[PDB]
Structure formats: structure tokens, C-alpha cells
């Protein structure tokens, strides 16, 4: 419900 991923590689 609250998980946030660094999805786009551009965000290191």
C-alpha cells in the first residue's frame, strides 16, 4: 500500500 520504488533508472 505504501511501498515506493526507484522505478526509472534516471533516479540513480
Amino acid at each position, epitope marked *: 500500500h505504501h511501498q*515506493k520504488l526507484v522505478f526509472f533508472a*534516471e533516479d*540513480v
Partner: antibody
Amino acid sequence: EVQLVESGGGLVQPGGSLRLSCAASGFTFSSYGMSWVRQAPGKGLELVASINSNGGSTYYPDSVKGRFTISRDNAKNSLYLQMNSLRAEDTAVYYCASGDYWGQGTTVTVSS
Amino acid sequence: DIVMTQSPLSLPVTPGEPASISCRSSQSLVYSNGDTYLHWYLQKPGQSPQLLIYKVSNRFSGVPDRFSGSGSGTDFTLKISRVEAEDVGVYYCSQSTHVPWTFGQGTKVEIKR
């Protein structure tokens, strides 16, 4: 609770203008890239515009480049899509997306 | 742009049987940190796309054990060990290693009868 609520959709005349807004919450908005993705009925997922953390840098496919502008407000935590010179093929459901999350989408209908 | 192409694009599955979907990228999806940003989406009928599997094999929240992912470089596979009625919809593979963010055509999974 990650949240992405879009607004600003509806009916637009050909060549007119429409502005999409996306309200984001539940995470540190300023740290992630965001995109607008659209979809025609019975069609695949089409990227409309991307923008990085600070924005910064943007991307537009030739489909909308020069007519569409994507922008970002890291205070309000809002994502915007400025749609100018709208034509018939712009008719679709538009999604505010973070890659790992998708909003419910808002419908844009270009018709006179 | 990184071309993502899936196979098959239409997948009728007899209830109780498993399912496989191929996905190939025109270039390697291995980023400079060793991670591979290849993902899978499921878009149930009349709904928004939802992240199913991220970075090749990692299940997102709520995703049951029957869904699994594997693959490396430019070749990737999504497996459903046993298709349930709830798994009906369109599956997209997607890469976020390169800009622009790109999607596959989408594979519509239906109930075979």
C-alpha cells in the same frame, strides 16, 4: 498510500487547448520521475511525456512534440500536461504515472 | 527507442493450465548499477494498469505466488503457474532503463473454451 489523481479532462474543440492536472501524495514526489501515458479504446499504452526529478529534462514523442508541454510543481506535488492545438487522435484516456503506480485516468475527447 | 516486443499477443488459457509470455528488448536493459529495469504490468478489464513484477523477478504488493518472472539481458519471461479467472486482462512488459520509457504491445489473456 501512494496516490495519483488526475483532472482537467473532458470535451475540447479541435485546435483548442486543454490542461491536465495530477495530484500526487503518499511519497516524496520531488525525488522521482513522472510521466503522462495515454490509451485509445482497445489500444496499447502510449507515452505522451516524461520529466525527471527536478524537471529538468523532458521527453516528447513526435506524436505530441511541439503541441504538448509537461511540467512539474514540487511544492504542490502536482504533475501538469499542457495540451495545445488538439486534434482528433489526441482522443484517449490519459494516465498520470510514476512507473510503479498509475492513476485512474481522465478522458479527453477532441470533437466539435 | 528501446523496442519491446511480446509473444504471443493473444493468449487463450484453459482454466487450470499455466501460461507463459515472452518479452524481448532491442537492447540490453542492464543499467550502470548492475540492476535490470524490466517490469510487468497487468491491466484488468475496465481498470488502470497495475505493476505486477518489477526488475525481472520481484513481485509487487498483493501479487500472488502463481505469478513469477525471470530472464536476463534482452530476453524475459512472465509465468503464471496456474491461470485463475481473476488473471484475465492485458499484460505489458516494460523497460525503464532507457529514455523514453517503453511498453510492449500487450498480451490479452482470455479464458479458452
